[PDB]
């Protein structure tokens, strides 16, 4: 089994890598979830974006 990312999973991994307002604990947890099972990428990305947006500088 070849486990190189589909587009979909890649765009989510990079997004998560680069969301600016996550703490590294938070980021690492989301990345670990995608490592574990890349098929949950959609849901994990949506959570990560919510959390990023909630923590934006104001
Ligand atoms: Zn940052
Ligand atoms: Zn302000």
Swiss-Prot record:
Q: Which residue ranges traverse the bilayer?
A: none
Applied uses, from the record: Important immunodiagnostic reagent because of its ability to bind the Fab and Fc fragments of a wide range of mammalian immunoglobulins.
Which regions does the record annotate with the repeat Immunoglobulin-binding region C?
1-58
> Looking at the record's lineage, which domain of life comes first?
Bacteria
Q: Where does this one sit in the cell?
A: Secreted, Cell wall
Q: How does it assemble?
A: Interacts with host TNFRSF1A; this interaction leads to the stimulation of both surface expression and shedding of TNFRSF1A.
Its domain description in UniProt is: Each of the immunoglobulin-binding region repeats can bind the Fc region of an immunoglobulin.
Instruction: Summarize the protein's role.
Output: Plays a role in the inhibition of the host innate and adaptive immune responses. Possesses five immunoglobulin-binding domains that capture both the fragment crystallizable region (Fc region) and the Fab region (part of Ig that identifies antigen) of immunoglobulins. In turn, Staphylococcus aureus is protected from phagocytic killing via inhibition of Ig Fc region. In addition, the host elicited B-cell response is prevented due to a decrease of antibody-secreting cell proliferation that enter the bone marrow, thereby decreasing long-term antibody production.
Q: Which family does it belong to?
A: Belongs to the immunoglobulin-binding protein SpA family.
What name has this protein been given in UniProt?
Immunoglobulin G-binding protein A
Supply the source organism for this entry. Answer: Staphylococcus aureus
User: What stretch of the complete protein does the chain hold?
Assistant: 270 to 327 of 508
